[PDB]
Design a protein around this ligand. Structure first.
Ligand code: JIS
Ligand code: MG
Ligand code: ZN
Length: 314
């Protein structure tokens, strides 16, 4: 029917509302977690259940078994968007609620565990098709593909216009997950906020703010309980070191972040990353959207955990 509420066990029903929720090690629970979130974030109405499930499963099929950029990441990034949307209920459009959780689930579709840099140095065909934001244009493209499979059009109820608006929100959202673009995006959002020019009625300004949300969900492994934060950092380094290995195979010394012989330098690299990227992201995000403050506090706690690791205090 449409009298078919999804529900979660008590500890999950309560903790899922919190920014620092971990979706856990039971792969088979993640789909239902996503639907739960769509239904609460959007409504039981916004998507035909049978179509949703078929889409979610095809998206899952199209994530690979890489250590980090995998289906678990997909659903983790959707959950942080869910927490932001639920703490800023009245700021977002009907179309924005629909399209943003879907953008997040799709945002790393068919990722191979290599940076856009590697694609470019290897001379991968995707580098020729898409010169900038290489994987990000691929992920958008794979999303549109899965939307076009029979029985997969979860947007079928929208008007011709709604449809192009929602697919334009997803495309920008997914493009924004390219961290090379984050720096300029946040610097402009910072000056807009501080000269008071920021105006959520300017589509151009919304666009930037959704981009920043996108970066903030994407990095949300820096906002978890220390033991999640630490064990997730291992997964991302396993991709970085394999890429370092492949750079070496093309005859290129990798940066030390990616050199698995320079493992000692992880803790100081996380510091640099928290200082250069994460802290500034969640800072500007908290200024624009005050109820997202717990992501900043959690990030700062984790920074301080990484300083303890350097000081040999663990
Ligand atoms: C720009 C890009 C990377 C930089 C790095 C590399 N670095 N380290 N961690 C990450 C990362 N995750 C988020 C997920 C969990 C752990 C951190 N996502 C992307 N790049 C990362 C170090 C210093 C400055 C940087 C500037
Ligand atoms: Mg990505
Ligand atoms: Zn991602």
């Amino acid at each position: 029917q449409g009298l078919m509420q999804f529900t979660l066990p008590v500890r999950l029903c309560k903790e899922i509302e919190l920014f620092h929720f971990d979706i856990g090690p039971f792969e088979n629970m993640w789909p239902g977690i996503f639907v739960y979130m769509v239904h609460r974030s959007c409504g039981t109405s916004c998507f035909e259940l049978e179509k949703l499930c078929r889409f979610i499963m095809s998206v899952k099929k199209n994530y690979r078994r890489v250590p980090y950029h995998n289906w678990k990441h997909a659903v983790t990034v959707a959950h942080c968007m869910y927490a932001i949307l639920q703490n800023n209920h009245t700021l977002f459009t009907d179309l924005e609620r629909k399209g943003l959780l879907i953008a997040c689930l799709c945002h790393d579709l068919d990722h191979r565990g290599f940076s856009n840099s590697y694609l470019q140095k290897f001379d991968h065909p995707l580098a020729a098709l898409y010169s900038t934001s290489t994987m990000e244009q691929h992920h958008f493209s794979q999303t549109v593909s899965i939307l076009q499979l029979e029985g997969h059009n979860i947007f079928s109820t929208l008007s011709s216009s709604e449809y192009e608006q929602v697919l334009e929100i997803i495309r920008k959202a997914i493009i924004a997950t390219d961290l090379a673009l984050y720096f300029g995006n946040r610097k402009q959002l910072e000056e807009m906020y501080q000269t008071g020019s920021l105006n959520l009625n300017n589509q151009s300004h919304r666009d930037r703010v959704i981009g920043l949300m996108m970066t903030a969900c994407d990095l949300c492994s820096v906002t978890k309980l220390w033991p999640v934060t630490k064990l997730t950092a291992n997964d991302i380094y396993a991709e970085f070191w394999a890429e370092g290995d492949e750079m070496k195979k093309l005859g290129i010394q990798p940066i030390p972040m990616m050199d698995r012989d320079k493992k000692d330098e992880v803790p100081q690299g996380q510091l640099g990353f928290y200082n250069a990227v994460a802290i500034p992201c969640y800072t500007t995000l908290t200024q624009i959207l005050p109820p997202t403050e717990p992501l900043l506090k959690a990030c700062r706690d984790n920074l301080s955990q990484w300083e303890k690791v350097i000081r040999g205090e663990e």
